[PDB]
Amino acid sequence: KKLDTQLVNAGRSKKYTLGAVNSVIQRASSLVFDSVEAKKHATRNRANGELFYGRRGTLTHFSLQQAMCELEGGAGCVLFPCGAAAVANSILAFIEQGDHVLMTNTAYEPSQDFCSKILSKLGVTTSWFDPLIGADIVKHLQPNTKIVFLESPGSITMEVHDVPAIVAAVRSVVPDAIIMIDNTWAAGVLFKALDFGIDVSIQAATKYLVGHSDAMIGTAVCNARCWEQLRENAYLMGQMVDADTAYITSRGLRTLGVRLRQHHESSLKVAEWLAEHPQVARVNHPALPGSKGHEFWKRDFTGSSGLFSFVLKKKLNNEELANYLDNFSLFSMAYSWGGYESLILANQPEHIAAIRPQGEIDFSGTLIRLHIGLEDVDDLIADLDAGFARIV
Amino acid sequence: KKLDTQLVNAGRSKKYTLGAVNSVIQRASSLVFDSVEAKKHATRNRANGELFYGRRGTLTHFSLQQAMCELEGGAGCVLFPCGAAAVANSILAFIEQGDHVLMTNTAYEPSQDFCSKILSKLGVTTSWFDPLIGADIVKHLQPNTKIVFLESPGSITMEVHDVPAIVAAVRSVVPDAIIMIDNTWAAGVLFKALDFGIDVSIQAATKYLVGHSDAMIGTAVCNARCWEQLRENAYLMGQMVDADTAYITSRGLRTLGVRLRQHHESSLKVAEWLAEHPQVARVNHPALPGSKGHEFWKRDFTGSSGLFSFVLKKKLNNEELANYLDNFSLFSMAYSWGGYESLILANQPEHIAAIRPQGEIDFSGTLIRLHIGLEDVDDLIADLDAGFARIV
Amino acid sequence: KLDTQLVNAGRSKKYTLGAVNSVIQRASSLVFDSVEAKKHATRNRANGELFYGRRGTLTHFSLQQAMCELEGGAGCVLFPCGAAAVANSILAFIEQGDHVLMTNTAYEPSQDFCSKILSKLGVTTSWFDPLIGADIVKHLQPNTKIVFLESPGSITMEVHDVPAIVAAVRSVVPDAIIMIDNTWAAGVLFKALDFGIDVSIQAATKYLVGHSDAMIGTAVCNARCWEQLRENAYLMGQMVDADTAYITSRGLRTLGVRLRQHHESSLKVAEWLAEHPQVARVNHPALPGSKGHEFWKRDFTGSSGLFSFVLKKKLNNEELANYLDNFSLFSMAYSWGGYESLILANQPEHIAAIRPQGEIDFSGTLIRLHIGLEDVDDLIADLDAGFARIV
Amino acid sequence: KLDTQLVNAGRSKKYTLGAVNSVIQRASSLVFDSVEAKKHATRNRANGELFYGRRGTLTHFSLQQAMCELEGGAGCVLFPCGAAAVANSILAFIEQGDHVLMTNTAYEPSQDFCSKILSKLGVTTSWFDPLIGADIVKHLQPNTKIVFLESPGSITMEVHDVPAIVAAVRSVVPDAIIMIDNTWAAGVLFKALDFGIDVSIQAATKYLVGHSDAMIGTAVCNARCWEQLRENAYLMGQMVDADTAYITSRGLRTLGVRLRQHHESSLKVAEWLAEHPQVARVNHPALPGSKGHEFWKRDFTGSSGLFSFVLKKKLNNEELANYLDNFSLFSMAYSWGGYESLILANQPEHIAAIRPQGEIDFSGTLIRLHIGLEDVDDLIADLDAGFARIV
Ligand SMILES: Cc1ncc(COP(=O)(O)O)c(/C=N/NC(=O)CNC(=O)c2ccccc2C(F)(F)F)c1O
Ligand SMILES: Cc1ncc(COP(=O)(O)O)c(/C=N/NC(=O)CNC(=O)c2ccccc2C(F)(F)F)c1O
Ligand SMILES: Cc1ncc(COP(=O)(O)O)c(/C=N/NC(=O)CNC(=O)c2ccccc2C(F)(F)F)c1O
Ligand SMILES: Cc1ncc(COP(=O)(O)O)c(/C=N/NC(=O)CNC(=O)c2ccccc2C(F)(F)F)c1O
């Protein structure tokens, strides 16, 4: 009943494993009906876990779906080729011309760009809010607000929402709004979005659930209210993921507890050490006091993953930036995160100000986003330490 | 320079094969930048075949993309999780509220349903045309017509468009329309859509390109005019396909010539034999005289694949339908087609009338859709022959 | 009916489970729901009940059923590559003091396994000319345990008179196990077990896979030999992974349309080469006049796309490079049986060193071709340009 | 630094090519752009230049580099499963007239390979008690070619005094090859090559893969033995597929966080069982009092999650079924080293039949547990309920 037991067993019914430990991998487009009667029975149950057509899924998808519903406490799981596909398509599934979308201004940039470049030309408007607005979100609601889009902690800058206050405020004014969250940082499990009255918990399963930086997949776990419309409207957009990726995602769940505990332990140690460092202005780790929304993190989360950022006292010029980033031995530059390896990315205040619509930034030094992987934490601190010496 | 040589070699540059015969399989979300300078160079070339992020693709995607552009004569290839995803997302990529979509009424049903259920609520209207309308398509154009959507031969009923006449008519009235085709029957190669002044040739690569009924993938090969907008707008919807599927698709190309010649030879023999059969009212095979648009097929296509249909003299009742379909030895019931195996599906006139908007059907008997696979053609004819005896 | 058999081979509902292709069951551990169930699996662990991944999953059982129906056998043993199937099939039947009799035209690693591994185990090997037929009795010892055939032969492509050899072997050493490396025929163009051969071995790597990207060996056995090969191979830990098994089953599906094209194209090239002024001889089983062509015509139901020819000259190293480095369509590589065309050269000296107890009978450079699925006239054009480089 | 090494092992840019993980290069044929290039690859075909798929691709070279750095070896030979690596590693070093000396606690198929395959090849095998240490000189013959260790032992979990055994072997038969099945330690909890062992073998199937869905064997060799094992294994056609190589490399990445959890959980279960009224003895290398625990504590840097214990009673078949059929979390299956927990029973008679030249010293039913990644208290609760079924 504990999470580690859940993780090992999630989705592993005999009807999916067929004698093996893991689900089978059923590769298929065509699924064969042995009779008119069977074909008619499959048609009736085509969105209900019966083999009907590859686009709806095979045993391998059904297994992952069951596992996701168990882990996040959902009525259904809808699958997508990547996180960005789960975001764009989850929002598209619930809107119509004349609707309003209200989204945190700390939302992953492609999530915002979907709203500003795709939704806008379909007669759907979007506005943005500061992630710490809490109960004052009422001020940003419109008569036509259909979706309220959360991301906690926020992309890059890591602000944690006061979800209880936000949800209560939204329900008080537009109770029939669809509230969605990009719950990728928490891996859907360190923060139980659906227990908080959120309708749809979306993940880039690409990150922690896969955990190895070698498959892409999006998930949206839905409450009972929202599942049908998300599923059927995403189907009309031909959204699916391949059977092999679904397998590898279920397989990822198996080590997610041991991995997250290590990401938590190590990232917190790095963040504490950064907080005491002379060259560091501020540390944005949700688990750390003085970080935005930390108190909501403590109250509402059961853990931390390994992604965070910190602000240098300096704003690095281009040469110092190259000097710092080019010469790391264990941290690599790359996008994505949630793998076994450590990563490093720089953002300048001007870059971040440009992706914070209807809001202001709160720092002026160069911002570094770290993913703390599974390497030895002291080796990692040594690498960060050598970096500091390169920009003193 | 012949198609078989093209097929063997398409996409197989050394930069993708790295010493092997086939492209490597590069599984990745994160792609690592070795320096700020490399990261900046990759950013600039991120839609241009340089490794940048898994969502844009890896070497394995780039190889398939190159192969598709070569085979269809396109400026670019955009990839999707399945055919239906390539259809919905190709159309979405070019529309805005207030636009009109004009689509053949013989379009695959999910293609129509995307228009009628998704587009309509985004302020985009759709109307339909008879596939043999040819130059008289002018009658259906509106000031706001943005897309004209073709499918030749048509789904199920197999009508071939007079593409030259349709294209010329559209260009005469709305020269800036986006003309698209679902070119899956031809596998993009028996009909060179882009040579015919079509802007986007879309395939369910799931069918012939894969050829084994075990992977799903959509492709849209674009002319230079349309590539950017399709690619960038599909990216904003997070559309991609996994590296393994891309590999398997490139691998499918290798035997597409030998497979199609066999599908052509065998299906034509079956269709000729059906045409002489007493229990058969009509045969809808594009390669066969008396079939709708056959003369356009002869003029414009370089071959036939293995999908066609025929109309029984009877309209089967439920019991005769079960008797017929339940008792085949080599034909199986399933959706999809374009694999190595033979398939059979029944449709009643009432079913087809319901998916032919703004048009009338032309038959009254039960319609049978056959996919002729790679089995021995005489074994296949024996199975069909036993079926006839079951419903005499 | 071969095309129909190929499409359906191994595709029982218990293996495909609603799909067209067999499922892919990746597993080491296989779970027993009860102690009874574990007893039942144990008693059936070599008889297609799930027991342990080393013995196989549904995916392996599917491929094994398919190979057995295609080659008309009692069982199909699986190996990580063709060379593993050859080495381990032979090992499974010998003991110290045995003798092995192998065609001198056998694939070199097959010969090497005998000369370098068996020899230190007290097993002797000697060799025969592939055209020996009934005169093979000459070479049969009272301790001859294995007679190992390869028809057509590696590189030089000589075809055995299998019926004559089998009759001779049975009359003198009935206890011998007769084996064939039947890869060139993809197991289906020559129905080895119907000719009285005990074990038909394939580098499934070749035409069965058909795409040059999976490695696997198979050994289809009659009922006389299946258990021994199966159990002794198992003691050596021989198996192949589930996904490779899947891909090999998948290969079968296009095997007919592929082999027909390899046949038609290779023979056209062969016929053109035979008439070429720069060509001494062509070694193609399907071509009239080739060594053993009479046996090919009688005993085979088709041809594949691998053959060789002898240049009138023996190329020197500069010529060799000018010829081979400058092809546009043919690539240099080992293996064959994929969709693409390949070229390799062997000098007569090289061949002389791998024909034990034999004598080479050509003096020009030998060129081995695999004719793939490219347009045949494009391929002839590429060879024509190669001839210009060496005139 | 093991966690850092695990994360990075084998991940050179030449293998990953811009990605985080190595590429997957599926290939049999590998193309030579020129005759020169083909010469160069040929001379380097065992030295990590692309030559033929049977020798490996980039993906195999990546895993081989990783195993070599993790176990401190000159080379890493790959096999389709652990049992293949054991059978073939031994074969690679013997000849007729040799003697093999193997722990009587060796995995049964390891013993069977010796008694059923080697014996008919003129190779003799005898066996020793795992706690023999320096007294192993007793068993060493002038023709002893292989000394084969397994520490901890299969099933009963006895830990060798490796330093004492190695010193004795070197003093008496310096030409002997000392081998270990080092799977329980995942190669990294016991640095076998640093103790003077020649070849460290793993069923990589176990902890390296870590998920019970890929099969593979590895044999990491010192410089003295690498070439022979490598070349002789190759003559047997031993290899593993590229995708399994990829997945094994991938396993390494979580190996540290996994092993630490298997250690912590298994030891807690062991400690609880040792104190249980229904339990006679617990066989866990990490538990004080277990056979060879002093050697585990001295020579190992950690523990994995596989161990066993002896019930006070010998269960009859009804009791066996009531105990084993009714678990909620532990499953019955062979293999171990995955994320899930497993249980198997062995009766003392069963064990007595696989301890050649040894004597069993327990009389109750022996229960082998693999402790996976589930919550340890859930697992203890499941065992507690099992005890209630048999009181
Ligand atoms: C909270 C969150 N939610 C969803 C996603 C998207 O997941 P996926 O599976 O689509 O990459 C992610 C993204 N991980 N990616 C990055 O940190 C890097 N992304 C970008 O720079 C980016 C920003 C905007 C457009 C594209 C990209 C691209 F580079 F292409 F990844 C995310 O962090
Ligand atoms: C011309 C054409 N174009 C695109 C597609 C879609 O490709 P994909 O890769 O998405 O299945 C296809 C479809 N192949 N599928 C069928 O013949 C069966 N499809 C349906 O019955 C169907 C109709 C409507 C909705 C779903 C389905 C579902 F069953 F789910 F396949 C097609 O024929
Ligand atoms: C009739 C026949 N039987 C078995 C095999 C071996 O099969 P596999 O799947 O092990 O490669 C094959 C071989 N494919 N190989 C070649 O054309 C060339 N191989 C060698 O000369 C060779 C022999 C020994 C070792 C390596 C090689 C290497 F060069 F790598 F190919 C074969 O032709
Ligand atoms: C120390 C050790 N060394 C090697 C192996 C074999 O590895 P692999 O990858 O070949 O399974 C293993 C084995 N895993 N197997 C088991 O716990 C049980 N296996 C057997 O008893 C057995 C022995 C011989 C043949 C089959 C089996 C089968 F039952 F199928 F598991 C091992 O424990």
Pairing mode, strands A178-182 and A145-151: parallel
Task: State which of D219, D254, D289 marks the end of a domain.
Answer: D254
Where does residue B322 rank: exposed (0-12), middle (13-18), buried (19+ CB within 10 A)?
A: middle
Residue list, ligand 3 pocket, CB within 6 Å: C 81-83, 107-109, 154, 181, 183, 203, 205, 215, 334-336; D 28, 51-52, 54, 237
Q: Which CATH number is D282's domain given?
A: 3.90.1150.10
- Catalytic-labelled residue, pool B27, B40, B55, B298: B55
Partner-chain contact C30 A19, CB within 8 Å:
yes
Protein residue with least CA distance to atom 23, ligand 3: C109
Residue C359's contacts (CB-CB under 8 Å, 6 or more residues apart) are none
> How far off is chain A from D212, nearest CA to CA, in Å?
7
Ligand 2 pocket mutation pick from B335, B347, B370, B371 by most atoms within 8 angstroms of CB: B335
The answer on B291 and B387 residing in a single domain is: yes
Owner of token pair 């902890």: D207
Q: Under a CB-based contact definition with an 8 Å cutoff, are residues C281 and C310 in contact?
A: yes
Beta carbons of A85 and B245 less than 8 Å apart: no
CA dihedral D202, D206, D210, D212 (to 10 degrees): 140
CA–CA distance, D343 with D333 (Å, rounded to integer)? 7
Are D80 and D88 in contact by the 8 Å Cβ rule? The answer is: no
- Please report where in the chains the tokens 């895993």 appear, as a residue: D63
- Closest-CA distance, D175 to chain A, in angstroms, reads 40
Check whether residue A296 and residue A152 sit in a common domain: no
Strands A367-371 and A307-312, sheet pairing: antiparallel
What residues in A contact B122, CB-CB < 8 Å?
A: 96-97, 122-124
Closest CB to D373: pick one of A257, A373, A379.
A257
Q: Tokens at residue D48, please?
A: 């990590």
Reduced to 3 states (helix: H, G, I; strand: E, B; else coil), residue D128 is strand
Q: Would you call A85 and B213 a contact, using CB atoms and an 8 Å cutoff?
A: no
Active site residue A383: no
Gap between the Cα atoms of B310 and C169, Å rounded? 58
Q: Which residues of B touch D26 (CB under 8 A)?
A: 20, 22, 25
**In whole angstroms, how far apart are CA A210 and each of A107, A213, C300, D243?**
22, 7, 51, 17
Please tell me whether residues A335 and A311 are part of one structural domain.
yes
Beta carbons within 10 angstroms of residue D24's beta carbon: 25
User: Is the CB of B255 less than 8 angstroms away from the CB of C256?
Assistant: no
Considering only the beta carbons, identify the residue of D31, D241, D321 that sits closest to C215: D241
The answer to whether residue C54 is catalytic is yes
Kindly report the nearest CA distance between residue A68 and chain D, in angstroms. Answer: 18
User: Which atom of ligand 4 approaches the CA of C28 most closely?
Assistant: 11
Token reading at C205: 């790597």
Ligand whose nearest atom lies closest to the CA of B29: 1
Residues B232 and B362 in one domain: no
Amino acid at residue number C213: D
Cβ neighbours of residue C349 closer than 8 Å, sequence gap 6 or more: none
Query: Among B67, B126, B56, which residue's Cα sits nearest to residue B98?
Result: B126
Q: Whose CA is nearest to atom 14 of ligand 4?
A: D335
- B389 and B266 share one domain: yes
Determine the Cα–Cα distance for residues D291 and D285; give it in Å rounded to an integer: 7
Question: How many Cβ atoms from other residues are within 10 Å of residue A224's Cβ?
Answer: 10
One domain, residues B304 and B242 = no
Residue B252, SS3? helix
Judge if A281 and A143 occupy the same domain.
no
Select from D107, D179, D304 the residue to mutate for testing ligand 4; criterion: most ligand atoms less than 8 Å from CB. Answer: D107
Experimental method, per PDB record: X-ray
Instruction: Please tell me whether residues C245 and C281 are part of one structural domain.
Output: no
Min Cα separation B162/chain D (Å): 44
Domain containing residue C49: 1-254
CA–CA separation, D42 and B222 (whole Å): 44
C210/B340 Cβ within 8 A: no
If you measure from the C-alpha of residue B53 to the centroid of ligand 1, how many angstroms do you get, rounded to a whole number? 8
Residues 6+ apart with CB under 8 A from D275: none
CA dihedral D264, D270, D274, D276 (to 10 degrees): 100
CA pair distance C157, C305, nearest whole angstrom: 12
The CA distance from D214 to the nearest CA of chain B, in Å, is 18
The three-state secondary structure class of B290 is coil
SS3 C299: helix
β-pair partners for C24: A25
Neighboring chain C residues of B22 at a CB cutoff of 8 Å = 211-213
CB contacts, 8 Å: A326 with chain B: 34-36
Can you tell me whether residue B263 is helix, strand or coil?
helix
Pair C103, C150: CB distance under 8 Å: yes
User: Helices C242-252 and C58-71 sit at what angle, rounded to 10 degrees?
Assistant: 40
- What contacts B391, CB < 8 A, 6 or more positions away? B279, B312, B314, B316, B320, B323, B324
Domain count for chain B, please give it: 2
C-to-N gaps above 2.5 Å in chain B, after residues: none
User: How far apart, in Å, are the Cα atoms of D348 and each of D107, D132, D155, D364?
Assistant: 16, 22, 11, 7
Cα dihedral: B374, B377, B380, B381 (round 10)? 160
From chain B, pick out residues whose CB is under 8 angstroms from the CB of C6.
Answer: 374
3-state secondary structure of D198: coil
Residues 6+ apart with CB under 8 A from C55: C45, C46, C234, C239
Domain boundary among D239, D254, D269: D254
Same domain, A14 and A74: yes
Q: Is any atom of ligand 2 closer than 6 Å to the C-beta of B204? A: yes
Cα distance between residue A330 and residue A340, in whole Å? 12
Report how far residue A79's alpha carbon sits from residue A202's, in angstroms, rounded to the nearest whole number: 10
Closest chain A residue to the Cα of B122, Cα to Cα: A97
Q: Which chains have 3 or more CB–CB distances shorter than 8 Å to chain A? A: B, C, D
Residue A153, preceding peptide bond in cis (omega within 30° of 0): yes
CA-nearest residue for atom 18, ligand 4, is D334
Same domain, C200 and C307: no
Q: Among candidates C243, C224, C370, C246, which has minimal Cα distance to C308?
A: C370
Please give the sequence-ordered ranges of beta strands (E in DSSP) within chain B, or none if there are none: 76-80, 100-104, 125-129, 145-151, 178-182, 200-204, 218-222, 280-284, 307-312, 343-347, 367-371
Residue identified by tokens 């590895």 is D218
Among D13, D18, D30, whose Cβ lies nearest the Cβ of B19? D30
Query: B252 to each of B187, B340, B378, C30, C255, how far by Cα in Å?
Result: 11, 11, 26, 33, 14
* SS3 state of residue B353: helix
The DSSP H or E segment spanning A57 is none
Task: Name the maximum alpha-carbon separation found in chain C.
Answer: 75
Residue C23 contacts residue C17 (beta carbons within 8 Å): yes
Residue written as tokens 């086939």?
B22
User: Which of B223, B222, B157, B210 has its CA nearest to residue B184?
Assistant: B210
In the sheet that holds D331-332, the strands lie side by side as D279-283, D306-311, D366-370, D342-346, D331-332
* Closest chain B CA to residue C212: B21
**Residue C62 · residue C20 · CB < 8 Å:** no
Q: Strand B343-347's sheet: what is its strand order?
A: B280-284, B307-312, B367-371, B343-347
Task: Give the separation between CA B293 and CA B284, rounded to whole angstroms.
Answer: 10
Closest to D186 (Cα-Cα) out of D166, D209, D163, D165: D209
Ligand 1 lined by B232 (C-beta under 6 Å): no
CA-to-CA dists, residue D144 to D98, D100, D176, angstroms: 6, 6, 6
Resolution (A): 1.8
* Structure tokens given for D332: 């019955």
The answer to whether the Cα torsion of C60, C66, C69, C73 is positive or negative is: negative
The catalytic residue among B130, B182, B199, B242 is: B182
User: Which of C188, C339, C371, C377 to probe the B interface (max B CBs under 10 A)?
Assistant: C339
Cross-chain Cβ contact D335/C52 below 8 Å: yes
Considering the domain architecture, whether residues D240 and D292 belong to the same structural domain is answered as no
Residues of chain B with Cβ-Cβ distance to D16 below 8 Å are 32
Residue D154's φ and ψ, nearest 5 degrees, are -60, 130
What distance in Å separates the CA atoms of residue A168 and residue A152, rounded to the nearest whole number? 16
User: What are the C-alpha distances in Å from C26 to residues C38, C273, D211, D240?
Assistant: 19, 47, 10, 15
| Residues of chain D positioned with their CB less than 8 A from the CB of B17 | 31
Which of the other chains make 3 or more beta carbon contacts under 8 angstroms with chain D? A, B, C
Reduce the DSSP state of residue A344 to 3 states and report it. strand
- Report how far apart, in Å, the C-alpha atoms of C262 and of each of C253, C305, C340 are: 16, 4, 10
Domain boundary among B255, B285, B320: B255
Q: Which of B35, B155, B177 is nearest to B105 (CA)?
A: B155
C357 & C374 share domain = yes
- Cβ of B33 within 8 Å of Cβ of A334? The answer is yes
> How far is C272 from C346, CA to CA, in rounded Å?
21
